Amino acid sequence: KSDVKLLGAWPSPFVMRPRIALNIKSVEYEFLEETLGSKSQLLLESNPVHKKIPVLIHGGKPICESLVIVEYIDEVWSPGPAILPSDPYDRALARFWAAYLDEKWFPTMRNIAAAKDEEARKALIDQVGEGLVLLEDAFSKCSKGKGFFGGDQIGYLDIAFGSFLGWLRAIEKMNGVKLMDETRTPGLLKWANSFSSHPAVKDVFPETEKLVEFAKVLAK
């Protein structure tokens, strides 16, 4: 348990990602929570560049950046279940969509709260919706009728996208909008239940209300 430590603020979609990956591999680890109002000295020592979490410490060495940590876990604990796809093209597509989610979609969605006027808010909400249309189509092609982006088993792209689901739901609730409905994202609604109920996910997955209330707490 001491050989693997995960530094992280909580709740956080980015911190969720290595927790799910460690769960898939059944790797025991200690979760070292950052707490509001300070940055721990271990955080400052382990991630001097970004000073953020997650940080995985393994063999006395820190590994930063959520997705990079996920790949590291997949590669190091290779006898366990595969997290990335095995085919190079499928792997490239999984990486492509995770990069889209982290670079475009999620920053857009969390900018909604700070929109100045009404039409800017609408533009951001429209962009989150167009992202979900794109991911609905990616899910159809990736899943091939199976339950996950990863196919029969949960995979890298499930972790990347699924980690955001709670925050999507909270932002839906706080803005009175429905961005996964049933007309626009039928596959993703189903996948959302498969993901949030998965045994490697459910005990680290946030209750929507908890996120909403936490956003209210942060408002400072």
Question: Is the CA virtual torsion 41, 47, 51, 56 positive or negative?
Answer: negative
- Residues in the annotated binding site: 39, 53, 66
Determination technique for this PDB entry? X-ray
Burial class (CB in 10 A: 0-12, 13-18, 19+), 37: exposed
DSSP state of 104: I
Burial class (CB in 10 A: 0-12, 13-18, 19+), 206: buried
Q: Is 64:47 a contact under the CB 8 Å cutoff?
A: yes
10 Å Cβ neighbour count for 132?
21
DSSP state of 151: B
For the chain, domain boundaries: 1-79, 80-220
- Residues in the annotated binding site for glutathione: 39, 53, 66
- Distance in angstroms (rounded) separating the CA atoms of residues 158 and 30: 23
